[PDB]
Curated annotation (Swiss-Prot):
CDD domains according to UniProt: Azurin
Cysteines joined through disulfide linkages: 2-25
Gene Ontology terms: cellular component: periplasmic space; plasma membrane
Span of domain Plastocyanin-like: 1-127
Pfam families to which the protein is assigned, alphabetical: Copper-bind
Protein name, entry field: Azurin
Length: 127
């Protein structure tokens, strides 16, 4: 409806590649969980949303910020929404206002844990 449940596993994979946000939604929520066995310092996953153009810079800034900031730069204006960084058996939800999205743009979601973004990314589109 106006939410999606996403799992990030021990093989650096999200279980979706593409999220659609319905125009009727005023908020949208992502419920993130982490099946598998590995703790967050070795296989952490977050779900972070930006424009496609901003993805790399978000990722690089996160790398500079490190594990103790959950691999995101504090106050990064390019981050539309984000969960916290989670490890196995943990969960986190993020809810954001759909007014923050422009219609028909293919934003990207991804994990900013070192090395996860090229495998752990997808599109989000407001339709
Ligand atoms: Zn990850």
């Amino acid at each position: 409806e106006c939410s999606v449940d996403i799992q990030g596993n021990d093989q650096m994979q999200f279980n979706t590649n593409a999220i659609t946000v319905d125009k009727s939604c005023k908020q949208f929520t992502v419920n993130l969980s982490h099946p598998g066995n590995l703790p967050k310092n070795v296989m952490g996953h977050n779900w972070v949303l930006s424009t496609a153009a901003d993805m790399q810079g978000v990722v690089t800034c996160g790398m500079a910020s490190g594990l103790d900031k959950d691999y995101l730069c504090p106050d990064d204006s390019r981050v539309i929404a984000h969960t916290k960084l989670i490890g196995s058996g943990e969960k986190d939800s993020v809810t954001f206002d759909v007014s923050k999205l422009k219609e028909g743009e293919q934003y990207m979601f991804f994990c900013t844990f070192p090395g996860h973004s090229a495998l752990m990314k997808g599109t989000l589109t407001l339709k």
